[PDB]
From a paper:
The complex consists of a tripartite ring comprising SMC1, SMC3, and RAD21 (also called SCC1 or Mcd1), which associates with a conserved peripheral fourth subunit that, in human somatic cells, is represented by two paralogs of the Scc3/STAG protein family, STAG1 or STAG2. STAG1/2 HEAT repeat proteins bind to the RAD21 subunit of the core cohesin ring and are required for the dynamic association of the complex with chromatin. The STAG1 protein is composed of HEAT repeats, a tandem repeat structural motif composed of two α helices linked by a short loop. STAG1 and STAG2, therefore, function redundantly in somatic mammalian cells to mediate sister chromatid cohesion, an event essential for cell viability during proliferation.
Author numbering: 85 to 257, 263 to 404
C-alpha cells in the first residue's frame, strides 16, 4: 500500500514472493504447484518447462526424464556453480526462499497432503538423476527443506507447551474451553507426527543416498545440514545410527568434506548436555579424529584441533 505501511512491514525479497505464491495456491493448487515444480527445474539450469497437462497426467519419473532431455549437452555449469556476478546471491536467495516458503505455510498449507507430497516426491526423483545439476539443486533444496521442517517442529513444541499450560490452568478451575484445549493438544501432536513423516521421507529418500554422492560439494551439503539437525533436534537426529554417517564421512578424500564433518561435530561437543549421547561415537572414531589434527590440509587440521580441545574440555 502506502510508503509507510510498506516500510513499517518491511517484507524481505523472499517473503514477498512467497506470500504471492501462497495466494496463488489458494486460488488454484495445481497451477501454483506447477510454478513451484518449474522453479526447481529452472534453478537447475534446465531450459525445459513442465505443462499443466503433464503435471496432471504424468508421474514424476516421466516428467523428470522429459526434462532431462532439455539440457545443454556441452555445458555442465548451472546456477549453483556459476561464478557471478548475477549468481553471487542466488544460492543465498534459493536457500532463503525454501525456509520462508515453509515458514509461511507451516500453519495450514503444509498439512494439506498435497503441497508437501508434491515437493518431496519431485526433489526425491531429481536427487537420483544422472544429471549433476539436478542432484545438486534438489539435494540442497531438500536439506534446507528438512531444516525448515525442524523449525516447524520447534515452533510446534512451543505451541504444545503453551496449550499444555493453558489446559492445566483451565483444568484447575468440563466446559467448552477445556474440550477445545484438549482438541488443540491432540491436533498439535498430530501435526508433529505428520512433520516427522515428512522428515523421514527426506532422510531415507535423499540424505542416505546423497551423503556419499560422487560430487564433493553434494557430500559437503549433506554433512553440514545433518549437523544442523543434530544440534537443533537432538532427540530425533542425534543417535548412533545417524552419527555413523558423520563418522564414516570423516574418512572423505576431499578436504572440504572433512572440514564440514569437524565443524558439525564441534557444535555437538560444545554442548555439555549432549556429551552422554556422544560417548559411544567418541570411542568408535577417536583414532580418526585425533589423526586429523595433523591433516594434510591446514584448514582441516585446525578444526580437528578445535574439536579435540572441545572433547577434552567436555570430559
Amino acid at each position: 500500500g502506502t510508503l509507510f505501511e510498506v516500510v513499517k512491514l518491511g517484507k524481505s525479497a523472499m517473503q514477498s514472493v512467497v506470500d504471492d505464491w501462497i495466494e496463488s495456491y489458494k486460488q488454484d493448487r495445481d497451477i501454483a504447484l506447477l510454478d513451484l515444480i518449474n522453479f526447481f527445474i529452472q534453478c537447475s539450469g534446465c531450459r525445459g518447462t513442465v505443462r499443466i497437462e503433464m503435471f496432471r497426467n504424468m508421474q514424476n519419473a516421466e516428467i523428470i526424464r522429459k526434462m532431462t532431455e532439455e539440457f545443454d549437452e556441452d555445458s555442465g555449469d548451472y546456477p549453483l556453480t556459476m561464478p557471478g556476478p548475477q549468481w553471487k546471491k542466488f544460492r543465498s536467495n534459493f536457500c532463503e526462499f525454501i525456509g520462508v516458503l515453509i515458514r509461511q505455510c507451516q500453519y495450514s498449507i503444509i498439512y494439506d497432503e498435497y503441497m508437501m507430497d508434491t515437493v518431496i516426491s519431485l526433489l526425491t526423483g531429481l536427487s537420483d538423476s544422472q544429471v549433476r545439476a539436478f542432484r545438486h539443486t534438489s539435494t540442497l533444496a531438500a536439506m534446507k527443506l528438512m531444516t525448515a521442517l525442524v523449525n516447524v517442529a520447534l515452533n510446534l513444541s512451543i505451541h504444545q507447551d503453551n496449550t499444555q499450560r493453558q489446559y492445566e490452568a483451565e483444568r484447575n478451575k468440563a466446559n467448552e474451553r477445556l474440550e477445545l484445549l484438549l482438541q488443540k493438544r491432540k491436533e498439535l501432536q498430530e501435526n508433529q507426527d505428520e512433520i516427522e513423516n515428512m522428515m523421514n521421507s527426506i532422510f531415507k529418500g535423499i540424505f542416505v543416498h546423497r551423503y556419499r554422492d560422487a560430487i564433493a560439494e553434494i557430500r559437503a551439503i549433506c554433512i553440514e545440514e545433518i549437523g544442523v539437525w543434530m544440534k537443533m533436534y537432538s532427540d530425533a537426529f542425534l543417535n548412533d545410527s545417524y552419527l555413523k554417517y558423520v563418522g564414516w564421512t570423516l574418512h572423505d578424500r576431499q578436504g572440504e568434506v572433512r572440514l564440514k564433518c569437524l565443524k558439525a561435530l564441534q557444535s555437538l561437543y560444545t554442548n555439555r548436555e549432549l556429551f552422554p549421547k556422544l560417548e559411544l561415537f567418541t570411542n568408535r572414531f577417536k583414532d580418526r579424529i585425533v589423526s586429523m589434527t595433523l591433516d594434510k590440509e591446514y584448514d582441516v587440521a585446525v578444526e580437528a584441533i578445535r574439536l579435540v580441545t572441545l572433547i577434552l574440555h567436555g570430559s
